Amino acid sequence: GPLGSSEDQTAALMAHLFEMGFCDRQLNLRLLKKHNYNILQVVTELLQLNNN
Amino acid sequence: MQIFVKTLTGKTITLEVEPSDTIENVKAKIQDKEGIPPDQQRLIFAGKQLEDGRTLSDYNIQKESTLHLVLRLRGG
Secondary structure, three states: OOOOOOOOHHHHHHHHHHOOOOOOHHHHHHHHOOOOOOHHHHHHHHHOOOOO | OEEEEEEOOOOEEEEEOOOOOEHHHHHHHHHHHHOOOOOOEEEEEOOEEOOOOOEHHHHOOOOOOEEEEEEOOOOO
């Protein structure tokens, strides 16, 4: 079917995370690869690290 | 005081909340228009979680503040 997904989408996702309160492109990258690009899981997983 | 809620879909919802408005009630003000369950509704403020049993004042939420809304869907 498709030839390939736009990897540029990752940049848009990163920006949404930075607007919250993380500013860690490294942590975001290692999280995105953990759930095969899942912004919903990344944000909630990161929150479980610093919610106190 | 009006505040803004930013969704992952790139939507900015405006809400009218009071200083004594509990986070749980805020979710209700979203539930009626969005239809999304409060239990699934997760609000992020400055990279921090908002407890349902806390008030806006607990997280120094003022006027025109932007709250992020993320949902953790479960499959199996």
